[PDB]
Amino acid sequence: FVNQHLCGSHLVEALYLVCGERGFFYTPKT
Amino acid sequence: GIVEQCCTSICSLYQLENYCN
Ligand SMILES: [Cl-]
Ligand SMILES: [Zn+2]
């Protein structure tokens, strides 16, 4: 797999795909 | 954070994998 700049909802889209059933935390405050 | 890691710089799906529950 390759790198890529993931920004805004595309990041959360990526996360969803990557994680799926496991779910994920989106926390831009870090 | 992920914004910095993946938006400001670049990242892989493995790096993204670190944020799954
Ligand atoms: Cl955009
Ligand atoms: Zn977009």
Side-chain angles (χ1 to χ4, degrees), chain B residues 2-18:
Chain B
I2 196 172
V3 175
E4 290 71 36
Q5 304 278 337
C6 295
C7 186
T8 303
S9 193
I10 61 188
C11 77
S12 55
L13 292 64
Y14 291 111
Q15 282 202 24
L16 283 177
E17 258 211 330
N18 298 320

Side-chain angles (χ1 to χ4, degrees), chain A residues 7-10:
Chain A
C7 294
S9 72
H10 300 285

